[PDB]
Amino acid sequence: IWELKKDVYVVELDWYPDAPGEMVVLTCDTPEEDGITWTLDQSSEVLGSGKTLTIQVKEFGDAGQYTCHKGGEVLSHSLLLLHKKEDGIWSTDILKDQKEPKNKTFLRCEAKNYSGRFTCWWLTTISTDLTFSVKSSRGSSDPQGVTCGAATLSAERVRGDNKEYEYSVECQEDSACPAAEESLPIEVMVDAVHKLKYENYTSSFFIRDIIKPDPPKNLQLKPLKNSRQVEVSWEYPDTWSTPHSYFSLTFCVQVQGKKKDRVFTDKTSATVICRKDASISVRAQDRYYSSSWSEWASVPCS
């Protein structure tokens, strides 16, 4: 048993049939010594008496909000969140497994630019009583300052017989240096809590590893007169870092319609040929460190 938050305790359990559980002692936070009664959750039945309480935590029915009373008044609280340990492997029930790019990938984080802002998405099929709490830091031997806001809901979708909920959180590095060479990585630590079941996750990365620049901005096409050849013109994405002569982006251009066109231009313009009812589609990638490609932003050939 250990402390997670103020007046919230996490009890570990070995999750095998007919388990012996764990031994747990509860102590009311009061200078008083006599006339103390205890109840579990909203039930009014008295479980025990005295300053100390001993229970044996065997299942979710024995966990819940414990309250000590004296004189008919609420003294303090003590919540018990279980933490299943299945043959040495902890449970991952709450957060849905994305399985990309590898298995057990629960938190997926991305950054638009190099300034030090990332954002982590995680999927679940649980609608009510769900409460996340994110904290993060850079390194573990001597941590630095990275601040994360509250975790909100971004979008909701339906897949299969169940639903699916997508959360997100915005984090900023406090001492961000966009130009340095990273040596030690960032840690993200999510504490997923659902009713009385506690879980907890971790992801580590380099900022240069999770960069996915925005789709290229302001796509305009002007073909040669009476010619199918079209020169492509665009500009660097707005959210990308500055100056653009330092943080350089190598692009990609395809022509799709309903014969494959693939060109990678380091210049903001290129020329291709559009077939009938085709679409010019553009990508982007950081030129020097191959982190990731961008989503296509397109306009159609007419």
């Binding site: 065997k58 299942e59 979710f60 449970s91 991952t92 029930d93």
Partner: protein
């Protein structure tokens, strides 16, 4: 209280004293996920206004119930209060027409009652070390299963076998493989209750069948093209009864590969097409190959050879031999046409045609196309010449034949001079003029006609008469005995008059 939470209060109906035969039965509860369980039962009799309830009683003795409504099954998670690490007692209570009907009690540990599911249709297939290998991803939270398979051919019944223990993220199963018949395979699992048999897995033969197809080619049109046509379609593969119309991934794919034998000086002369898209061909020679393939690879291919057209057309082909090279002139067909010229020496059985490719050409002021080469067509020889052209040289199916004819290289006028010319006395007033066929006769369409010249030496009178190109013997009549005469013969072409043979002097003695 809630849809997924047990209520630890009394059911709002009295207990069952009726004991009617019709009611809930066969209550089984399995664990479907890491924290979700389901319980299913069957109801006997009419379902007119029947509400079922699932009841549970923990080890401590406190009893709770779920409000299943009119559904025949219910789902709940481990936080509902139903104990999952211990011993619980579950029984179904149904309310109908103002009566209660209970079910036989079942006592189990819900964390242990796990039912395993067969693979979810996505089974990989492969050939390894002479035996068929199939791999499937493991179902979620269902590791550690004994897996057992059954298989059959079109002519054999089910045969049962074992694959071995499975304890990974993806499973595997080693199975024998048939050579020409397909197989059906069905699969089931059980943890270290046996699962239901899978959806069918169908396996095609390791070697695809030979493409049993027949082709036909049209006659060469005036546009210089002919179309290829399929006379017979490939025979269908024999599949087991359970695989007929099932498993589109076991189908044989057929591809048509075209190889243009003419214009070998071109960069690319091969193209692959679908058997459903029949191509247009020129008067050139082509090789057509059909390749059959399946998930294991390609089978044996069949190739058909299409010969070149032998028809000769009288086209105005002018060839000029200069001090620096030879130039060809012929009527242009259309604008921006790329021409490929092929010539073969006559009498050279199996000799490869010399290929010459031109840049795209437009008709000149005289409406002619031209090609020049350095000092090359050997001199004093006959060549069979065929010209092809295309406005889209990259598309082999758009090439067309421009002309096909024979041409004599070099000085046709000098080399075409009739040889072995002889004059023999036939009568007191006639002579026989016999000669050997000129070299031009060996070039079809080049020799237009012969001309015979007779000169009376005493009167100096000269007479000329044309002779057919197939005749090398003529009898000249109406001559005077005792007079000296001179005779010469020449071979004329479609454009130039030949050189006269050496003058033969003769006189009629008798």
């Amino acid at each position: 209280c809630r849809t997924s939470e047990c209520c630890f209060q009394d059911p709002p109906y009295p207990d069952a004293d009726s004991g009617s035969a019709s009611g809930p039965r066969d209550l089984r509860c399995y664990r479907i996920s890491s924290d979700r369980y389901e319980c299913s039962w069957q109801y006997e009799g009419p379902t007119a206004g029947v509400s079922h309830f699932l009841r549970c009683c923990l080890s401590s003795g406190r009893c709770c119930y779920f409000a299943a409504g009119s559904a025949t099954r219910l789902q709940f998670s481990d936080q509902a209060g139903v104990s999952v690490l211990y011993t619980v007692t579950l029984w179904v209570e149904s309310w109908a027409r103002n009566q209660t009907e209970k079910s036989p009690e079942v006592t189990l540990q819900l964390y242990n009652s796990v039912k395993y599911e067969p693979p979810l249709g996505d089974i990989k297939v492969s050939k390894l070390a002479g035996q068929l290998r199939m791999e499937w991803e493991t179902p979620d939270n269902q590791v550690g299963a004994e897996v057992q398979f059954r298989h059959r051919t079109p002519s054999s019944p089910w045969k049962l076998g074992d694959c071995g223990p499975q304890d990974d993220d993806t499973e595997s199963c080693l199975c024998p493989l048939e050579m020409n018949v397909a197989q059906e395979f069905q699969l089931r699992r059980r943890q270290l209750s046996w699962s239901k048999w899978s959806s069918p897995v169908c396996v095609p033969p390791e070697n695809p069948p030979q493409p049993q197809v027949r082709f036909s080619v049209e006659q060469l049109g005036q546009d210089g093209r002919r179309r290829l046509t399929l006379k017979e379609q490939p025979t269908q593969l024999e599949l087991p009864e359970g695989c007929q119309g099932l498993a589109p991934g076991t189908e044989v794919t057929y591809r048509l590969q075209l190889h243009m034998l003419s214009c070998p000086c071109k960069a690319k002369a091969t193209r692959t097409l679908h058997l459903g898209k029949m191509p247009y061909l020129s008067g050139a020679a082509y090789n057509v190959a059909v390749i059959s393939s399946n998930q294991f690879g390609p089978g044996l291919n069949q190739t058909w050879h299409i010969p070149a057209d032998t028809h000769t057309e009288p086209v105005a082909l002018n060839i000029s031999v200069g001090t620096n090279g030879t130039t060809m002139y012929w009527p242009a067909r259309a604008q921006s046409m790329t021409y490929c010229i092929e010539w073969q020496p006559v009498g050279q059985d199996g000799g490869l045609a010399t290929c010459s490719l031109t840049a795209p050409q437009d008709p000149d002021p005289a409406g002619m196309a031209t090609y020049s080469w350095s000092r090359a067509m050997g001199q004093e020889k006959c060549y069979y010449i065929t010209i092809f052209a295309s406005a889209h040289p990259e598309k082999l199916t758009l090439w067309s034949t421009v002309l096909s004819t024979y041409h004599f290289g070099g000085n046709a006028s000098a080399a075409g001079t009739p040889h072995h010319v002889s004059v023999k006395n036939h009568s007191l007033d006639s002579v026989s003029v016999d000669w050997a066929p000129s070299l031009l006769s060996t070039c079809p369409g080049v020799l237009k006609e012969y001309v015979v010249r007779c000169r009376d030496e005493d009167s100096k009178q000269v007479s000329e008469h044309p002779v057919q190109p197939t005749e090398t013997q003529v009898t000249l009549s109406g001559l005077r005995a005792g007079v000296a005469y001179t005779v010469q013969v020449r071979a004329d072409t479609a454009w130039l008059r030949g050189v006269w043979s050496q003058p033969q002097r003769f006189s009629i003695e008798g």
